[PDB]
């Protein structure tokens, strides 16, 4: 067949969000609140193109907007966030429910210094709409032309010409 | 019976039987070509209904 095209290693260099999973899980509700638009443009491009090579730049925007999400935490509320993700980080299942007062301190300092409202129960699971400028893929599966169907039956049904025509049976 | 009656009755019998014999040979040839090519209404062995395919957005994108 053909050669599969791959992007170069410079096309894959972006500054990584090099924080732990409890750090990501601690700020995840405010992350889904504040980093909505580039994340949803990326996941729309990712379910529509069905190809990650066509989804690099939007992904870079994700990694552009996540870092600016954490810098904006690090400039303002580094200590209550640190006290919060440490308590998230203790738990083996990483329970939100074991960590409600540290969550309250982090949410208080974030609403005071950044004005961010934490999403409620049922908001980040909504199907939202995304206004992009990229065109709709007319053939995301790269499917070739389908075979033409067999001709259907038409014409009025006539009797059998002289019956069964089986050796001597005249009907 | 008159010789006219037997004669013309014989011609009608011969018309019916010649038409039936030509139609039997055409039936053989039609079945041969429809088994060879599969483009007629016979020998249409079933395939999978494509209405069974779930075209919803799935859990992972790459599919
Ligand atoms: C206005 C609206 C109302 C109008 C009303 C008008 C009518 C009023 C009267 C009402 C009654 C109508 C009767 C039926 C129509 C006429 C049927 C007919 O004569 O067919 C001729 C038919 C062929 O002749 P034809 O010149 O081509 O057609 C003239 C008509 O146009 C015949 O028409 P066709 O050209 O369209 O024929 C079609 C085709 C013509 O046939 C063909 O093209 C050839 C294929 C025939 C079958 C061959 C099979 C051979 C191997 C098996 C042999 C079995 C053993 C033999 C019998 C042993 C005992 C059972 O038929 C078939 O293929 C079907 C099979 C044969 C059925 C015949 C009727 C049987 C009814 C009574 C059953 C009693 C036993 C009869 C004999 C059974 C064996 C057949 O003759 C035969 O096949 C030979 C058998 C004899 C005919 C049956 C006669 C029926 C009356 C019998 C009374 C006596 C009974 C005694 C006691 C019982 C026996 C022990």
PDB file of N, CA and C in Angstrom, chain A residues 46-47 50-52 141 150-151 161-162 165-167 169-170, chain B residues 16 19-20 23-24 27 38-39 44 58-63:
ATOM      1  N   UNK A  46     -11.248  16.051  17.583  1.00  0.00           N
ATOM      2  CA  UNK A  46     -10.740  14.709  17.797  1.00  0.00           C
ATOM      3  C   UNK A  46     -11.793  13.650  17.492  1.00  0.00           C
ATOM      4  N   UNK A  47     -13.059  13.878  17.868  1.00  0.00           N
ATOM      5  CA  UNK A  47     -14.118  12.980  17.411  1.00  0.00           C
ATOM      6  C   UNK A  47     -14.540  13.204  15.965  1.00  0.00           C
ATOM      7  N   UNK A  50     -11.155  12.003  13.548  1.00  0.00           N
ATOM      8  CA  UNK A  50     -10.826  10.603  13.865  1.00  0.00           C
ATOM      9  C   UNK A  50      -9.356  10.287  13.612  1.00  0.00           C
ATOM     10  N   UNK A  51      -8.492  11.273  13.810  1.00  0.00           N
ATOM     11  CA  UNK A  51      -7.092  11.214  13.428  1.00  0.00           C
ATOM     12  C   UNK A  51      -6.324  12.197  14.298  1.00  0.00           C
ATOM     13  N   UNK A  52      -5.404  11.728  15.147  1.00  0.00           N
ATOM     14  CA  UNK A  52      -4.698  12.651  16.045  1.00  0.00           C
ATOM     15  C   UNK A  52      -3.700  13.543  15.342  1.00  0.00           C
ATOM     16  N   UNK A 141     -13.728   8.545   7.221  1.00  0.00           N
ATOM     17  CA  UNK A 141     -13.287   7.162   7.193  1.00  0.00           C
ATOM     18  C   UNK A 141     -12.422   6.835   5.991  1.00  0.00           C
ATOM     19  N   UNK A 150     -28.041  -4.063  -6.520  1.00  0.00           N
ATOM     20  CA  UNK A 150     -28.680  -4.860  -7.550  1.00  0.00           C
ATOM     21  C   UNK A 150     -29.971  -4.185  -8.011  1.00  0.00           C
ATOM     22  N   UNK A 151     -30.380  -4.408  -9.262  1.00  0.00           N
ATOM     23  CA  UNK A 151     -31.628  -3.800  -9.744  1.00  0.00           C
ATOM     24  C   UNK A 151     -32.835  -4.390  -9.032  1.00  0.00           C
ATOM     25  N   UNK A 161     -45.651 -18.460 -18.252  1.00  0.00           N
ATOM     26  CA  UNK A 161     -45.894 -18.844 -19.638  1.00  0.00           C
ATOM     27  C   UNK A 161     -45.966 -20.358 -19.748  1.00  0.00           C
ATOM     28  N   UNK A 162     -47.196 -20.852 -19.920  1.00  0.00           N
ATOM     29  CA  UNK A 162     -47.535 -22.270 -20.046  1.00  0.00           C
ATOM     30  C   UNK A 162     -47.121 -23.059 -18.807  1.00  0.00           C
ATOM     31  N   UNK A 165     -43.699 -25.691 -16.848  1.00  0.00           N
ATOM     32  CA  UNK A 165     -42.796 -26.180 -17.898  1.00  0.00           C
ATOM     33  C   UNK A 165     -41.925 -27.334 -17.405  1.00  0.00           C
ATOM     34  N   UNK A 166     -42.506 -28.200 -16.586  1.00  0.00           N
ATOM     35  CA  UNK A 166     -41.784 -29.313 -15.978  1.00  0.00           C
ATOM     36  C   UNK A 166     -42.232 -30.591 -16.683  1.00  0.00           C
ATOM     37  N   UNK A 167     -41.514 -30.929 -17.746  1.00  0.00           N
ATOM     38  CA  UNK A 167     -41.519 -32.160 -18.535  1.00  0.00           C
ATOM     39  C   UNK A 167     -42.786 -32.506 -19.299  1.00  0.00           C
ATOM     40  N   UNK A 169     -46.111 -31.436 -17.415  1.00  0.00           N
ATOM     41  CA  UNK A 169     -47.166 -30.807 -16.634  1.00  0.00           C
ATOM     42  C   UNK A 169     -47.515 -29.493 -17.313  1.00  0.00           C
ATOM     43  N   UNK A 170     -48.720 -29.426 -17.871  1.00  0.00           N
ATOM     44  CA  UNK A 170     -49.145 -28.281 -18.656  1.00  0.00           C
ATOM     45  C   UNK A 170     -49.611 -27.110 -17.807  1.00  0.00           C
TER      46      UNK A 170
ATOM     47  N   UNK B  16     -47.041 -24.269 -28.591  1.00  0.00           N
ATOM     48  CA  UNK B  16     -46.924 -24.291 -27.133  1.00  0.00           C
ATOM     49  C   UNK B  16     -45.675 -25.047 -26.701  1.00  0.00           C
ATOM     50  N   UNK B  19     -42.399 -23.118 -27.664  1.00  0.00           N
ATOM     51  CA  UNK B  19     -42.213 -22.019 -26.722  1.00  0.00           C
ATOM     52  C   UNK B  19     -41.728 -22.523 -25.370  1.00  0.00           C
ATOM     53  N   UNK B  20     -42.277 -23.647 -24.897  1.00  0.00           N
ATOM     54  CA  UNK B  20     -41.833 -24.201 -23.622  1.00  0.00           C
ATOM     55  C   UNK B  20     -40.400 -24.713 -23.686  1.00  0.00           C
ATOM     56  N   UNK B  23     -38.072 -21.726 -23.696  1.00  0.00           N
ATOM     57  CA  UNK B  23     -38.066 -21.155 -22.356  1.00  0.00           C
ATOM     58  C   UNK B  23     -37.300 -22.010 -21.355  1.00  0.00           C
ATOM     59  N   UNK B  24     -37.301 -23.337 -21.513  1.00  0.00           N
ATOM     60  CA  UNK B  24     -36.492 -24.180 -20.629  1.00  0.00           C
ATOM     61  C   UNK B  24     -35.003 -23.955 -20.852  1.00  0.00           C
ATOM     62  N   UNK B  27     -34.143 -20.727 -19.305  1.00  0.00           N
ATOM     63  CA  UNK B  27     -34.114 -20.873 -17.851  1.00  0.00           C
ATOM     64  C   UNK B  27     -32.779 -21.431 -17.383  1.00  0.00           C
ATOM     65  N   UNK B  38     -24.013 -13.321  -9.976  1.00  0.00           N
ATOM     66  CA  UNK B  38     -24.673 -12.879  -8.766  1.00  0.00           C
ATOM     67  C   UNK B  38     -25.351 -11.532  -8.855  1.00  0.00           C
ATOM     68  N   UNK B  39     -25.648 -11.053 -10.061  1.00  0.00           N
ATOM     69  CA  UNK B  39     -26.224  -9.731 -10.256  1.00  0.00           C
ATOM     70  C   UNK B  39     -27.719  -9.758 -10.551  1.00  0.00           C
ATOM     71  N   UNK B  44     -29.147 -14.692  -4.366  1.00  0.00           N
ATOM     72  CA  UNK B  44     -28.823 -13.553  -3.518  1.00  0.00           C
ATOM     73  C   UNK B  44     -28.690 -14.060  -2.092  1.00  0.00           C
ATOM     74  N   UNK B  58     -18.581   7.274  20.061  1.00  0.00           N
ATOM     75  CA  UNK B  58     -18.224   6.184  20.951  1.00  0.00           C
ATOM     76  C   UNK B  58     -17.419   6.712  22.136  1.00  0.00           C
ATOM     77  N   UNK B  59     -16.864   5.793  22.931  1.00  0.00           N
ATOM     78  CA  UNK B  59     -16.123   6.184  24.125  1.00  0.00           C
ATOM     79  C   UNK B  59     -14.758   6.759  23.772  1.00  0.00           C
ATOM     80  N   UNK B  60     -14.106   6.203  22.760  1.00  0.00           N
ATOM     81  CA  UNK B  60     -12.837   6.679  22.242  1.00  0.00           C
ATOM     82  C   UNK B  60     -13.043   7.247  20.838  1.00  0.00           C
ATOM     83  N   UNK B  61     -12.251   8.232  20.415  1.00  0.00           N
ATOM     84  CA  UNK B  61     -12.509   8.854  19.109  1.00  0.00           C
ATOM     85  C   UNK B  61     -12.060   8.048  17.896  1.00  0.00           C
ATOM     86  N   UNK B  62     -10.947   7.323  17.995  1.00  0.00           N
ATOM     87  CA  UNK B  62     -10.301   6.726  16.824  1.00  0.00           C
ATOM     88  C   UNK B  62     -10.990   5.423  16.441  1.00  0.00           C
ATOM     89  N   UNK B  63     -12.047   5.555  15.643  1.00  0.00           N
ATOM     90  CA  UNK B  63     -12.782   4.411  15.106  1.00  0.00           C
ATOM     91  C   UNK B  63     -13.622   4.780  13.885  1.00  0.00           C
TER      92      UNK B  63
END
